[PDB]
Design a protein around this ligand. Structure first.
Ligand code: HEM
Ligand code: HEM
Ligand SMILES: [Cl-]
Ligand SMILES: [Cl-]
Ligand code: NA
Ligand code: NA
Lengths: 713, 713
């Protein structure tokens, strides 16, 4: 059946905004996963998981009699899709169970792992999500094998359909670089937002870059991908060597024996894939990656053998039974156990990417320090496994259960506890009046609160106005934030704050984080008053101010908006059309198409554009909260044409006189072109819609102001 | 960006079920269009429309100073996409304004018509839907030009995204038949459910079949397509000649002058398309279809000149200025007015398809009767225009406003008024107990109520249990309905009915339509009781019983289920996989994926399968309402393989012993295969899910029982 995507493959796609509807979710509208989890008997679940480790099923027998390696890999792949550029991927939504991730080549036979966990999932039902269960199982595998974890938080709610993530443009699994849809250009520069070297891989190619078995060049890829997953050199080394202390790879025969991945398999496969024609197709005969490497002399127990082997032998290039490049220890005895036959032993083996930990000079220093000080290695690995598996969970307030680590970690973007009375409704009214008496304008107030709140992204639940990080490096210097204007607003709000707090007794005080947001609310109220209308903008106090030392400047850099169509901002010239980037921003803000539409139209007329641009400011009463944007956008009296100077700017002229009435960007005019967006704009541009527009604007403004408010969830 | 559809293009698509979410709808959750419409000043709207017909805009000047022909075409196209096979298309959702219909070649320049209506749309806002306004404008156009319409109903609520309709498989607009995706096979057999001869056409090619200008062969296509749009020969002739009493076609120059359709046009086009490089590109120079025909001497006034010309001249094959085949009156005077130059006149002209009305022998007899009796022609046209424009509106209960026709028409599947008090809650309890005491089984009761209610389709709002048409021809003899079993059930319910009604005082009585539904309710309660669970199934009385004489048997044929995966039923062998057909049926029933899932799993274990088939009956307590279907489908101890006899039937065997446990179809096992459906099944198959399964089942059962209950809206 031919579809709209076939006819118009470059038309803007809005379905990414209308994912995660109550239509596809089986749980009732009222279901609250945190509440269900909080009642789970987590200790019972962990007992069941421990039992499972050595309960081998014949349809996928356990290596060494212990599923722990398989499960650590499962948990590591669940978390390992995470990209810092957009916060997408990661373990927090359980997306490993859906397309495409359930069928990525690097996820081969993790279908079997997941199926092993169905009886437990079934037994505890809604009180433990698959998303949580996958991480918990990895933890229990570690514990079962003698490694003490740093802790565990529940609270990842399950999702019910695939997310729309850009995973690259290649049309071939595992395609090497430089093809027609290459994710690399220049001197091996990976395109943002990607964090893997090939389509369908988690990070890097275990044989080496584009298959070339060079550990030194492989290190470069490892460093770059892992940095794009928020991991530094120490964390990277700890995770790779820690992981590879356990289990084995699977490459017992040629890859051509492996059949269809799960999404391609027959209905009778019942959701599994990669069925293999090689010998028994499983166990001793398994084929997953094609590599045949067992790293340590005790693959089912924590040890210090990984670095003992890495440094204690010289390594020779060889091939697995499937023809894959890997490494064998020169002159070594057969000291590695076989996974199934007690009478067979094997020489130590390594991947190319394992040898990178020794042959890259900066990794070599860390690895040697871990070899000499295994307690340092064990602590680094524990910490990095916690980070790996919680990096997309958001503020600590979302962390559930009895194993949450008390230690506050910098990567959590921590927010201090509030320890004083909060402002009440009378105080909020007093502060809004002081703010409006100061001389700050509607445009300034709205722009500043928007700058502060709109850093939030739902993908990894980072950002937002909590913390008052807008006052700190690097937010305060971001171009989109208008650093000089912002400094002036903040100075005035800081003096309001200081004066209010100085007059209180008790310990009541207002945070600057709250005051920024409240001031934005005063600006939206005043804008409604400018339009002749009473309005009340909801405000919830309780944000705190984080310090500079609680704000990792390098980590915060991925939150910088380089495109923000809500402020008609584009930092540079991109390949992707600006309206595409607006929908991507809308998705990160968790907005539906209607919310995106009302929000942008209001921001326009309130003066939120960067640089005071008149692009899309379709009103003759700027700083008044009206539906002017939509009424004027849809007026057929105006004709639109791209300028000579710039094809991404448009001039709107009176159709009869030729006179210039407005200018706009693609972000502006898409509302008058896209057939679904223009249907939305029509509702808000109708003569019966001024009250609707204000009500809907205030609701979405409030939504944005509270996106990070998990302390009120 | 590569998507799941690219990787796995034949995987089943569930997004058709989660269209029309509250996420994409800008109106609040509580908005009720009927309430808004009921207070519209419809007369004021029609006054503004009447004024509009002769107020020309320079950006698309009005032919002859009158937009009436443009707007009649607009409304005929709005309604003209309707197919009886599935009820899809039609005017009732305003889908002309979205992709793909907004960009079909046959809809060329209707973008301009719709734009001309924005000021009115804007003025009246949410109180008149685009869907209604498109039809109302066609009516007003007819009225303004001297034609008395049969009436008008409002109540088509607007939609906010495109429907997922199968419009054919061709990858080229207007592709002639016999291509690699040909919609024709055999001796010019058009594939179901399609109702047009080419991709992007409303019905037929105005030049003739695949462009061969033969009126006799074009008649064949006309008859077949119009029959697939529920029109008979008399209605077809009336419509075509009626329409072509007005306006003109547009073909002033070559087609290559016409640019991109709206979905492909530049953002600056602001939702318009087909911009033409030919002279002024509009008005006297317009190009729409490429044909250049004006049918009558008064294109802005109702007349009987179309048949006068048709029969009063002989016709010669000629070419338009764009090279299209059309017909000109041999030896005629220049009596047809020009659309813009008062000093020019033209000879009469016709399309090939217009001459079909004279050269097809059956059309000729009708056309001649209409020529001799133009009052007959006007009445037939008025009735057929009403049918055309209301065919997908559903039961007369949905019809709103002051111009609804009082005459009840057979094609409306009419339901007699109820004229007696209804049963109350205590009566319903008494009846459920009588039904259960009769000996009728859970399987009988659930199967019969399902058979009666599940003919409903949301596409045109036909079908459902109201009417008790299950007792009548042709429903009572449909294979899916198990005619002999059904007759026995109905006899027993009819005796219960007679005994209850005989005992009442006052005029209280219960309809057989209500009793069939109530009995099904008693069967679901009893099945819950059989499982250890007391539940009350909601029931709403007020259905009435329609007669055989109020039931058009031929029209009812398109509602026969030839595939019903809810009953594990396939009447024959189809190209489309059965699971595809289940999701198509779920969409017709207005079901979400969770609803489809729960409902199927419960039906299985209640014994609703046709023929008492064991396929999918994964329980040892049939006729008890339990979640056994899901628990047993998801049990990894059972291995599934296609049978030798039939690849579409599967055996489930114990994995260890080989013992045969179950058999299933693709419809059953897709719940264990598809990654999204299996996630749903897992929720219902969990150990905490018994109460949820029962509650969700009862709610979806009740929803199906009430699909046609617009009397309670
Ligand atoms: C440069 C990074 C990495 C590369 C290229 C990589 C590569 C792979 C490959 C190819 C396999 C074999 C799959 C198979 O055939 O069954 C595997 C196994 C595994 N990896 Fe990694 N890996 C990396 C990092 C990680 C990390 C960070 C962890 C966890 C902290 C991890 C834990 C595991 C474990 C436990 C196994 C063994 C699976 C089993 O016993 O079934 N690896 N690795
Ligand atoms: C076999 C069926 C039909 C065919 C092949 C057909 C074909 C066409 C074509 C090719 C045009 C010219 C489009 C343009 O170039 O602007 C047109 C115009 C029009 N048709 Fe039809 N038509 C059919 C049926 C109908 C019916 C059922 C109605 C309404 C009852 C309708 C009403 C009109 C009107 C009013 C116009 C004039 C548009 C104007 O003045 O701008 N036609 N038709
Ligand atoms: Cl994601
Ligand atoms: Cl439709
Ligand atoms: Na994420
Ligand atoms: Na329809």
């Amino acid at each position: 059946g031919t579809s709209n995507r076939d006819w118009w493959p470059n038309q803007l796609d809005l379905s990414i905004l209308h994912r995660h509807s109550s239509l596809s979710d089986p749980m009732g509208k009222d279901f609250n996963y945190a509440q269900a989890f909080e009642k789970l008997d987590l200790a019972a679940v962990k007992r069941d998981l421990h039992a499972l480790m050595t309960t081998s099923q014949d349809w996928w027998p356990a290596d060494f009699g212990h599923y722990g390696g398989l499960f650590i890999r499962m948990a590591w792949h669940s978390a390992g899709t995470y990209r810092t550029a957009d916060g997408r991927g990661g373990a927090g939504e359980g997306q490993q169970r859906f397309a495409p991730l359930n069928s990525w080549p690097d996820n081969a036979n993790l279908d079997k792992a997941r199926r092993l966990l169905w009886p437990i999932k079934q037994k505890y039902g809604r009180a433990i999500s698959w998303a949580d269960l996958l991480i918990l199982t990895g933890n229990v595998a570690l514990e079962s094998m003698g490694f003490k974890t740093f802790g565990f938080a529940g609270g990842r709610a399950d999702t019910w359909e695939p997310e729309d993530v850009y995973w690259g443009s290649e049309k071939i699994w595992l395609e090497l670089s430089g093809g027609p849809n290459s994710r690399y250009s220049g001197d091996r520069q990976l395109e943002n937002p990607l964090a893997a070297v090939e389509m369908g891989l988690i990070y890097v190619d275990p044989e080496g870059p584009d298959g070339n078995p060079d550990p030194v060049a492989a290190a470069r890829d490892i460093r770059d991908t892992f940095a794009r997953m928020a991991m530094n050199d120490e964390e990277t080394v700890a995770l790779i060597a820690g992981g590879h202390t356990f289990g084995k790879t699977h490459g017992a025969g040629p890859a051509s024996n492996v059949g269809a991945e799960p999404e391609a398999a027959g209905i009778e496969a019942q959701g599994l894939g990669w069925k293999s024609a090689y010998r028994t197709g499983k166990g001793a005969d398994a084929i997953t990656s094609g590599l045949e490497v067992t790293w340590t002399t005790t693959p089912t127990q924590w040890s210090h053998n990984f670095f003992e082997n890495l440094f204690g032998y010289e390594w020779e290039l060889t091939k697995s039974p499937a023809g894959a490049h890997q490494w064998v220890a020169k002159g070594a005895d057969a000291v590695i156990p076989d996974a199934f036959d007690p009478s067979k032993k094997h020489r130590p083996t390594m991947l190319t990417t394992d040898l990178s930990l020794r042959f890259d000079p900066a990794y070599e220093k860390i690895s040697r320090r871990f070899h000499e000080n295994p307690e340092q290695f064990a602590d680094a690995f524990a910490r990095a496994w916690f980070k790996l598996t919680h990096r997309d969970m958001g503020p600590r307030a979302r962390y559930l259960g009895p194993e949450v680590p008390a230690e506050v970690l910098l990567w959590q973007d921590p927010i201090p506890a509030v320890d004083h009375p909060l402002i009440d409704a009378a105080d909020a009214a007093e502060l809004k009046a002081k703010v409006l008496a100061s001389g700050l304008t509607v445009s300034q107030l709205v722009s500043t609160a928007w700058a502060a709140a709109s850093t939030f992204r739902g993908s990894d639940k980072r950002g937002g106005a909590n913390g008052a990080r807008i006052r700190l490096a690097p937010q305060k210097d971001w171009e989109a934030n208008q650093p000089e204007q912002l400094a002036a607003v903040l100075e005035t709000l800081e003096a309001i704050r200081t004066a209010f707090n100085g007059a209180q007794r008790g310990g009541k005080q207002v945070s600057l984080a709250d005051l920024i947001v409240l001031a934005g609310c005063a600006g939206v109220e005043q804008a409604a008053k400018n339009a002749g209308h009473a309005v009340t903008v909801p405000f919830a106090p309780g944000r705190a101010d984080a310090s500079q030392e609680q704000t990792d400047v390098e980590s915060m850099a991925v939150l910088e908006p380089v495109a923000d169509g809500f402020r008609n901002y584009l930092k540079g010239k991109y390949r992707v059309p600006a309206e595409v980037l607006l929908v991507d921003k809308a998705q990160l803000l968790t907005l539906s198409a209607p919310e995106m539409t009302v929000l942008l139209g209001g921001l326009r007329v309130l003066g939120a554009n960067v640089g005071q641009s008149r692009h899309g400011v379709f009103t003759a009463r700027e700083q008044a909260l009206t539906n002017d944007f939509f009424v004027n956008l849809l007026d057929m009296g105006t004709e639109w044409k791209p300028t000579a100077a710039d094809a991404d700017v448009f001039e709107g002229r009176d159709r009869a006189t030729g006179e210039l009435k407005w200018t706009g960007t693609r972000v502006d005019l898409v509302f008058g072109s896209h057939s679904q967006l223009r249907a939305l704009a029509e509702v808000y541009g109708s003569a019966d819609a001024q009250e609707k527009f204000v009500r809907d604007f205030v609701a979405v403004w409030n939504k944005v102001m509270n996106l990070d408010r998990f302390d009120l969830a």
